[PDB]
Amino acid sequence: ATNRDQESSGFAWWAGNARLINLSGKLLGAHVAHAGLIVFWAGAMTLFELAHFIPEKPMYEQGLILIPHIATLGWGVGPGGEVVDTFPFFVVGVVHLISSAVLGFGGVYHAIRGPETLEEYSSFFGYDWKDKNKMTTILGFHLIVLGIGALLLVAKAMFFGGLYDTWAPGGGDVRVITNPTLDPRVIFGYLLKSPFGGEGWIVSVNNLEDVVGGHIWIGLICIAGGIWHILTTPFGWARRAFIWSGEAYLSYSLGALSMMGFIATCFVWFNNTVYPSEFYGPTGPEASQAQAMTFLIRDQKLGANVGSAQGPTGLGKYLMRSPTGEIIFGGETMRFWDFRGPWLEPLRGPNGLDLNKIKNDIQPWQERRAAEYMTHAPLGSLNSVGGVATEINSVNFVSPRSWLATSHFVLAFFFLVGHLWHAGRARAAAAGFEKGIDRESEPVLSMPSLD
Amino acid sequence: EVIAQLTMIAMIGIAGPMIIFLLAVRRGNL
Amino acid sequence: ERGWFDILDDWLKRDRFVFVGWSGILLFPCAYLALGGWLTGTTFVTSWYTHGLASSYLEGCNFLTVAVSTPANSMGHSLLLLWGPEAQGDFTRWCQLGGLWTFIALHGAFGLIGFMLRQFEIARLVGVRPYNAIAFSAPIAVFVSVFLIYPLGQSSWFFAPSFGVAAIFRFLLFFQGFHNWTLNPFHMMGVAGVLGGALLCAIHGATVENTLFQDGEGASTFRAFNPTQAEETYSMVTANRFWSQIFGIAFSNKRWLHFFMLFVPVTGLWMSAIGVVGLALNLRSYDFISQEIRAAEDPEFETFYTKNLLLNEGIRAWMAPQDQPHENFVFPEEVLPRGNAL
Amino acid sequence: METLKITVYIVVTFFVLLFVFGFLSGDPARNPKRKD
Amino acid sequence: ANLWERFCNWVTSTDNRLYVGWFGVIMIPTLLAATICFVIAFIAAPPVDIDGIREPVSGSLLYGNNIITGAVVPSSNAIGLHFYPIWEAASLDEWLYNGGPYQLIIFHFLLGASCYMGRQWELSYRLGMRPWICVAYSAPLASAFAVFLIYPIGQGSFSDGMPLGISGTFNFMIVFQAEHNILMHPFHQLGVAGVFGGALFCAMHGSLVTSSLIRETTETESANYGYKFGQEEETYNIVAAHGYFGRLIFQYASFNNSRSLHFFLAAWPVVGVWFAALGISTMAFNLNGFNFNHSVIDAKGNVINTWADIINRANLGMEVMHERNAHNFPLDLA
Amino acid sequence: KLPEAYAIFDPLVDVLPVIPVLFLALAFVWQAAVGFR
Amino acid sequence: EGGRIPLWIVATVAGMGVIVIVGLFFYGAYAGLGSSL
Amino acid sequence: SYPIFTVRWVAVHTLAVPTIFFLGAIAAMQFIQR
Amino acid sequence: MTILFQLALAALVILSFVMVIGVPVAYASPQDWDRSKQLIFLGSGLWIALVLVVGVLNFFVV
Amino acid sequence: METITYVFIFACIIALFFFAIFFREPPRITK
């Protein structure tokens, strides 16, 4: 045993993994073994989901988060998101699970049997954290790997069956994307969109053409960026701006993942394009809009003139104006007028919700969908009792959107803590005071008093 | 069936501690 | 000189794993019974006859919903002794009548007395000043005002808190709906003492841990402290500068700092106790008279104060029939206050 | 309102530029021990 | 040294009475803007249509409030999550009616407080300290983000953000209980453990250190004069403090390592408040407290109420009454 | 459901997802075996 | 004999017993009394 | 060398003995059906 | 075929369990490493073969 | 009169912050 106790490593058992900072072979084992855990979960969880899956029930009634990810890619589903073939789900699960053994093997080997350090064994695989060119080279390899990944999504969408399109004319269906958006003014225009209401930054992406073309751009940007980083070494300004150490690099990645986690939270909460409501359930905004639609339909069937119906406050009971004048659903859902969904858009005209269309053109399928969504709003208790806090037991439901938003907020938040923890520590360690103040060289004692 | 599930988890559950126990007895590189 | 008292004193004060002392004669049986009574009640005992509630694991409750519930309102403030005129020595009926509630409350009360006596006894024997006992007067002020004084001013023990997680939550919401207890300045000082105390705990701990002197080679810095060392393990001078520049003020005196840490949460709890003594008599900070005169005359005048009273009014009407079953409230649907739609 | 918007846009940009360029100005070196 | 170089040196100077720093360059103007707007609004702002139903709520002192009832009122439900800066309004009169001050204040405050946290790292670095005080401050900061930003995002409106006032705070709490059963949520329960425990441990540490102060003063003077700022010797006897507390409970329940003790003092309330923040941030997406309504049933199928069902009755009272004119349809879905 | 041919391995599939948690716990068993040195 | 059964085994077995009993308690939340069914 | 029955022994058992008993009781409750 | 598939998948599971315990134990054991090395190679080859066998036989039972 | 009173107390508190920070008893190192 070398470096495997506190006295020799300087790190207590609870910070045991910090013993790995300068042991590249064991550290590679740690990473490969960990990747095996991720892949293990993706496989085993999928198989669990499939084993419990009742095809005629909506996925979102079944506590599924992974099968919806597979379905969104166009595998296993047909028109309206109906499940036509569960075998693709099985394949994804099995192959991941099988693959996890291989990674597990490599991880366990490198961690406890292979060379503890890689530097004497291999110039290529060995590395020093302070070697800036080697660090950017490994980064470059991974950027290429990621760029290829993004192009695989493009490949599925364009050449291998397509993706599930909730917006498909005539109703939601799998659709091959023939004409992806390449126009950089559209693709990069998303990035400059305000994150606030009615805009929603990149979370606003509302068609698959933009999604696919975005990944073409990202695929090529990552590959180009990767090549760039293999062939160059950090510039002077970059060298003076950053801390160069394993812990510093960890901290930058922690900050990045925190940011990403927060973005994914808002994505699953608001976006119904790459998270189709057919699989994930309605968004909070959607279900609220759908309740107003439901009672507009019901009450209009009963004889109500929904355009002229004055509510208790003086605002329209069913329909009112947005602050810029568009016709929108009334009641509290006034806040959700930015919502856009395939069941609702047919009633929308240039001025907003069209009274003529509302009076004449609401189809039973729209009524069904609104009723489905109103009663599958993403509200529920920790023990999975669906609905508001005051509901009695009966409906076993918490929306996949709630599970996914909450989990990723928790994760993103702790990863921000982790960033601050490691970024702060990396600064202190590089400057040489991470273990405490030198009693004989206490900086404050050499400074003038403040007063 | 609950017994089959419990039998599976018990065998998977013991596997980890078993590895450690076997290595401790064999004076392995823990 | 060396009689039976002195011999007994020797044995009570032996340096053993669990110190006993004279205070232990009071503490250990009362504490054990309070805890034992709670565990017994929450595992096996119902609240069907006192509250119309299930309250034990036996009945199907979980950790959050089990409770040892207060006796029925018709019990008044009966001590409800096992051998008393209500239960008349019958253990089963005693349990059904809420005898475990007074059992836990009263043994709990004498237990806390024993614990604070223990704090005094140990401090004297070890030769330290008894500030820990003094700080414990706050938990005592709280237990006494809430579990004893409050119900004693009310109609019966029924309205004391029941010993359970959800039951305590119910107590909070009752206090909001009936007493508007959030509006009470004594509760507000309590909140300031608790949150201020938690703040002081976090900030002092973090400050010490981040102004440590390097007294070892370890990157894990805990081993670089010796209990018997003469030197401070962290820099007060550096800590002081940091805070002075960050916040504008900083501690400079370590003795003041630590006394202030006693003072803040201890004083806060004391203030909250005074508020509850008032609520024992329904002497609430319920209203602002000026707000009510204005609102009554002017139907366009609205504040967050008026909004919260409407919520209280809802709490009272909706919870009262089941929460106060001895009243036999029947509120027909039509009288229930409700906003639009809901 | 347009004038206010432009003013605030300029103010904000100014301070944001100070923050970015400020931290770019050899920040790791601004410490009491190892200036690197 | 050029202008820029001297400016950088001043900004990062360890000799400023209040540290500025790079985070300070953002912190100072944003906190001043937030503070000035808050004070003016709390004193003088007219009533705000919080719920977008043309029912303006008076929050300011001059419009019939006191310190306890007064608030800066959240922006209109009609706005939702839309960005509502001053220049988006046709006039200040409109801006005020719709609750523009709330957004200005909270956005400036959250940015400034984030920079306050960064500044704490920054000075620690300048002073050669360890860096994690800012990590402790992330607990209260995260909690501010939870009630002012995350919850409104989840619910789709800044009208559901916590009001900037004493009674508005209680309003937020009561409605939160009605809609999420927060009391029955384990993250809030952890939060309570964090703050109750933090107060307990604060009183504990305060009492134990004070109990074991070494005699350095006469009867007639304050014992605080027994410690001198910057003295090298420790001012109390930890071995005596441990000897006391180890006997109060048992030996291995008491700390004899000051560093470990102080770490615990930091970690307990901080972690608890992290969970509190996460409670609010995850109830923001309607994953609510435990629901045991009608969980206990007899042989026939009669509901046997528990304390959970009594909590439910209280929650129903809050639910049916809140925002009494705002709801047109039977379910409150956000 | 899984394809019928796999039905017998169904109770095993039900328990696999928890395995990652067991890895975290295993680290503690291991550390206990080496005295948390 | 004071030291024969290693402490790490006792901890692991004791810990596993806690998980099993608490796990049983959670199972009971979904079946029989207190299950809502 | 070491005593077996002590004050510590009693304190441990006043807690341990009912705890295990209670846990068996609550274990059994998990199979009760209405 | 169905019985072939059944036993091949059963063998895959059993071998997996043996490897899960055996590989780490062998990797950290002082003696019998020469004996261990070849068995791990044999175990791995057989494990891969069984995956492919179960993979192919899948289509003649589903 | 109430508004004046509340604003007065607040103003006095803000003034107190100023003096507590800038006209504090300066911390002096001794033993």
Ligand code: CLA
């Ligand atoms: C993702 C989880 C994870 C991973 C991948 C690692 C990785 C690693 N750790 Mg860390 N650690 C973790 C979490 C993790 N750790 C946690 C939660 C704690 C706190 C309890 C620690 C505390 C800790 C300390 C104190 C130390 C490590 C060390 C190490 C390294 C050497 C371990 C060793 O010497 O084994 C010895 C143990 C054995 C030989 C027993 C067998 C272990 C194997 C790997 C089990 C695999 C079983 C698996 C089911 C088999 C599948 C095979 C199949 C594919 C065929 C290794 C790279 C050490 C180090 O840094 O070395 C310098 C070290 O000192 N860890």
Ligand code: CLA
């Ligand atoms: C991205 C993460 C994620 C998300 C969103 C979900 C979501 C879901 N899962 Mg999956 N799963 C996950 C990861 C996740 N899971 C992991 C890691 C495992 C391995 C144990 C599983 C294995 C699994 C099984 C076996 C099942 C599910 C099921 C479900 C559904 C119900 C969940 C439930 O009732 O929770 C209940 C809530 C809890 C148990 C509370 C979690 C509390 C955690 C511990 C708090 C974490 C806080 C933080 C990270 C701690 C850090 C401390 C800090 C101070 C450092 C739901 C769709 C069920 C289903 O319906 O399947 C179809 C089901 O049977 N999951």
Ligand code: CLA
């Ligand atoms: C990113 C993870 C990673 C990295 C950087 C390494 C790197 C290394 N390994 Mg380790 N290993 C890994 C994971 C990894 N391995 C996995 C998953 C397994 C299980 C199969 C192993 C099993 C293993 C053994 C038994 C040995 C090594 C050895 C080595 C060294 C020499 C290898 C060589 O020269 O190949 C030269 C290149 C080739 C032979 C061609 C590579 C063919 C690949 C697999 C094609 C596919 C590439 C594609 C990008 C992978 C996508 C997978 C992705 C979806 C996860 C080197 C230090 C040796 C050692 O350490 O010496 C003492 C050694 O004996 N590895």
Ligand code: CLA
């Ligand atoms: C994992 C992804 C990754 C990582 C970690 C790096 C890492 C690095 N790159 Mg590389 N790069 C990448 C991908 C990546 N690159 C890709 C995909 C491309 C192709 C476009 C490039 C092209 C590239 C070039 C041309 C250069 C680098 C450079 C660098 C170095 C310093 C860059 C820096 O200071 O950024 C921080 C950014 C700044 C200091 C600029 C101002 C910061 C503003 C305020 C950011 C505004 C965004 C803000 C956060 C909020 C808006 C939200 C946003 C999501 C829209 C560093 C080693 C430099 C280098 O030294 O080359 C050898 C350099 O010149 N990269």
Ligand code: CLA
């Ligand atoms: C120091 C420990 C201690 C203390 C302070 C208490 C105190 C209390 N107990 Mg608890 N109890 C204890 C230990 C203790 N108990 C133990 C060890 C057990 C297990 C057996 C119990 C089991 C128990 C039960 C089942 C009950 C109590 C109850 C009570 C309450 C009423 C007691 C009473 O009225 O007695 C009055 C007696 C005295 C005050 C002692 C008098 C001594 C004087 C000074 C001498 C005079 C007596 C004389 C010699 C006798 C001549 C009488 C003759 C004329 C007939 C009170 C809160 C009751 C309660 O909680 O109801 C809600 C109740 O039902 N206790």
Ligand SMILES: CC1=C(/C=C/C(C)=C/C=C/C(C)=C/C=C/C=C(C)/C=C/C=C(C)/C=C/C2=C(C)CCCC2(C)C)C(C)(C)CCC1
């Ligand atoms: C380093 C280390 C660690 C770690 C480790 C790891 C993390 C690992 C791993 C691992 C892994 C990651 C693994 C794995 C695996 C796997 C496997 C073994 C598998 C398999 C599978 C199978 C056999 C299958 C089958 C099937 C089929 C085919 C179909 C259907 C059904 C079924 C499912 C039945 C720890 C912490 C301990 C600590 C110390 C050190």
Ligand SMILES: CC1=C(/C=C/C(C)=C/C=C/C(C)=C/C=C/C=C(C)/C=C/C=C(C)/C=C/C2=C(C)CCCC2(C)C)C(C)(C)CCC1
């Ligand atoms: C896929 C698959 C598989 C796999 C597997 C695996 C991968 C496993 C594993 C495993 C593992 C990975 C395990 C484990 C474990 C464990 C455990 C069971 C644990 C624990 C624990 C505990 C209990 C602890 C405790 C403690 C201690 C010791 C110390 C301190 C304190 C305490 C108390 C905390 C198989 C073959 C079946 C086949 C089919 C498929």
Ligand SMILES: CC1=C(/C=C/C(C)=C/C=C/C(C)=C/C=C/C=C(C)/C=C/C=C(C)/C=C/C2=C(C)CCCC2(C)C)C(C)(C)CCC1
């Ligand atoms: C009342 C009474 C009495 C007494 C009694 C007693 C003294 C009892 C006891 C008792 C007891 C003494 C019991 C017990 C118990 C217990 C239990 C039932 C337990 C448990 C537990 C658990 C379940 C755990 C858990 C946990 C925790 C806490 C933490 C973390 C994790 C866990 C999850 C592990 C007498 C006869 C004088 C008379 C009259 C009345």
Ligand SMILES: CCCCCCCCCCCCO[C@@H]1O[C@H](CO)[C@@H](O[C@H]2O[C@H](CO)[C@@H](O)[C@H](O)[C@H]2O)[C@H](O)[C@H]1O
């Ligand atoms: C649209 C955005 C696209 C992003 C494009 C990327 C370009 C990145 C810009 C890098 C330029 C920053 O360059 C940086 O500037 C400052 C200020 O002049 C320099 O100058 C600084 O030098 C030293 C550094 O120790 C400081 O003590 C000194 O106060 C300061 O003058 C830095 O040494 C230099 O590294």
Ligand SMILES: CCCCCCCS[C@@H]1O[C@H](CO)[C@@H](O)[C@H](O)[C@H]1O
């Ligand atoms: C337990 C109640 C304590 C009351 C103390 C009264 C002590 S009484 C005292 O006891 C001495 C020996 O201890 C005897 O020598 C003496 O005769 C007797 O009066």
Ligand SMILES: [Cl-]
């Ligand atoms: Cl309200």
Ligand SMILES: [Cl-]
């Ligand atoms: Cl509504």
Ligand SMILES: [Fe+2]
């Ligand atoms: Fe201290």
Ligand SMILES: [Mg+2]
């Ligand atoms: Mg099954």
Ligand SMILES: [Mg+2]
């Ligand atoms: Mg049950």
